[PDB]
């Protein structure tokens, strides 16, 4: 059985950030640039029979709302990421490098990037009992493990959820007293955004500000 059904649509609302490095900061406004998810972008919401081969771009944003662990792993020689009741399976071959870690209403998010021959995994477990459109709450996706395989990946196949695409952008991450991400503001979205970016502050007063050149 392989059924067909037209795809749906939805919009991102200020979701998806992760620590660009392993370093700690406290109550500062450190600025950085990387491959992030731009704010207010179309999210191709896939509702489940359907499992097409999704084109793995430079950076994705995988997030499932809540199920009974029907999702087990993903597809990426070929990377075999999958989870069983026993140790999570990490293998690399054309199944028809290997590694295992440990035997294994809400909301889960995952981002996949591949730079310098490194496969990074940022994730976050959020207990949320909201509705089809995910709510608006700022949170980060801490790193879990970095297994390097350094191979050529172009396609990924899943095993109700959302997917998105990352782009090279410059952000501004606000840090609290405990060094946790609480607020994020961009400066490639709206004129107010780049004003806030160049002034390096979260409040702007009346006046004129020079931003860039045309």
């Amino acid at each position: 059985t392989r059924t067909q059904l037209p795809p749906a649509y939805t919009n991102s609302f200020t979701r998806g950030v992760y620590y660009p490095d392993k370093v700690f900061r406290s109550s500062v406004l450190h600025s950085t640039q990387d491959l992030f998810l731009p704010f207010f972008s179309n999210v191709t919401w896939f509702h489940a029979f359907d499992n097409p081969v999704l084109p793995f771009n430079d950076g994705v944003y995988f997030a499932s709302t809540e199920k009974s662990n029907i999702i087990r792993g993903w597809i990426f020689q070929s990377l075999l990421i999958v989870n069983n009741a026993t140790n999570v399976v990490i293998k690399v071959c054309e199944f028809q490098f290997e590694y295992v870690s440990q035997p294994f209403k809400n909301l889960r998010e995952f981002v996949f990037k591949n730079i310098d021959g490194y496969f990074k995994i940022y994730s976050k477990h959020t207990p949320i009992n909201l509705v089809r459109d995910l709510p608006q709450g700022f949170s980060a996706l801490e790193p879990l493990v970095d297994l390097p395989i350094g191979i050529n990946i172009t396609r990924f196949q899943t095993l109700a959820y959302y997917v998105g695409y990352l782009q090279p952008r410059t952000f501004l991450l606000k840090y609290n007293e405990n060094g946790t991400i609480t607020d994020a503001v961009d400066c490639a979205l709206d004129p107010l955004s780049e004003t806030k970016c160049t002034l390096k502050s979260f409040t702007v007063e009346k006046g004129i500000y020079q931003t860039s050149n045309f």
Binding site: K22, F24, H30, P148
Partner: protein
């Protein structure tokens, strides 16, 4: 300025040795057409094996002096090995143009590491010529750093179809070296190994042979941690880091909090160099007693 008194080391925790015999002293080596890459982690390298034992033919280290090699911890060591003609050795250089540097593995301009080479008399040579080794000769476009080509399509020249349509202006991009014992020294095969690494980009994975020392506190002393070094008073901290976070910065993005790989605790760093002298006098003519002052 306050002067530091002692020095402390909390640098290593590993014990395994880096696999190197197969890297250098062995004989099975891939062609320059397809160069193998090896991953090395969680062990200790030794310059004494490389610098001291034997002499080989090349010890050209770029970016970092060889004498200080096994003194700074690295991250994600990568090793590359291949065999080329001795006449082609000079072409392997940062930014130097060359046929192998144009159509085969090309060294980046900013490469930071070392290259070791030595001649092969007959180990990789045949009396009739070692034709297994091949070098790329013809290519439509140049390559980018750390790239490989696997297509064996017949090179295309002019408008005549090639790459399967054998004919005029069509040539095989790969040529046999044909190493022979009777060949000249410059034409003899040379065994060259390329090693590369990264510094201060990630937690320590491959550290030097130097062992750790005890841990003192409340006195500004020289400290080293995975490569980072500095001077300042060390003391306990109250800020709690994430289980993965190691370093610590400030508004100025300057190191002020470190995690000991042994004790696994939040350590504070405070400046110890400070002071300025102001001298007040009642005048040379009047008297000679003086009263020094320290500014801060």
């Amino acid at each position: 300025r306050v002067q530091p008194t002692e020095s402390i080391v909390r640098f290593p925790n590993i014990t395994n040795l880096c696999p190197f015999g197969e890297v250098f002293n062995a004989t099975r080596f891939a062609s320059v057409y397809a160069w193998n890459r090896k991953r090395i982690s969680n062990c200790v390298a030794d310059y004494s094996v490389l610098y001291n034992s034997a002499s080989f033919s090349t010890f050209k280290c770029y970016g970092v002096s060889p004498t200080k090699l096994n003194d700074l911890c690295f991250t994600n060591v990568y090793a590359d090995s291949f065999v080329i003609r001795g006449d082609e050795v000079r072409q392997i250089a940062p930014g130097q143009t060359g046929k192998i540097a144009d159509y085969n593995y090309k060294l980046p301009d900013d490469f930071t590491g070392c290259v070791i080479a030595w001649n092969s008399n007959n180990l990789d040579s045949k009396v009739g010529g070692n034709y297994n080794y091949l070098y790329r000769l013809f290519r439509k476009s140049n390559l980018k750093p750390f790239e490989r080509d696997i297509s064996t399509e017949i090179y295309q020249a002019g408008s005549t179809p090639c790459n399967g349509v054998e004919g005029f202006n069509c040539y095989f991009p790969l040529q046999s070296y044909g190493f022979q014992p009777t060949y000249g020294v410059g034409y003899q095969p040379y065994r060259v190994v390329v090693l590369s690494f990264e510094l201060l980009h990630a937690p320590a994975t491959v550290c030097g042979p130097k062992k750790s020392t005890n841990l003192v506190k409340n006195k500004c002393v020289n400290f080293n941690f995975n490569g980072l070094t500095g001077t300042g008073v060390l003391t306990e901290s109250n800020k709690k880091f994430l289980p993965f976070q190691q370093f610590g910065r400030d508004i100025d993005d300057t190191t002020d909090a470190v995690r000991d790989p042994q004790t696994l605790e939040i350590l504070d760093i405070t400046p110890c160099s400070f002071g300025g002298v102001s001298v007040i006098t009642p005048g040379t003519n009047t008297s000679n007693q003086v009263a020094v002052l320290y500014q801060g």
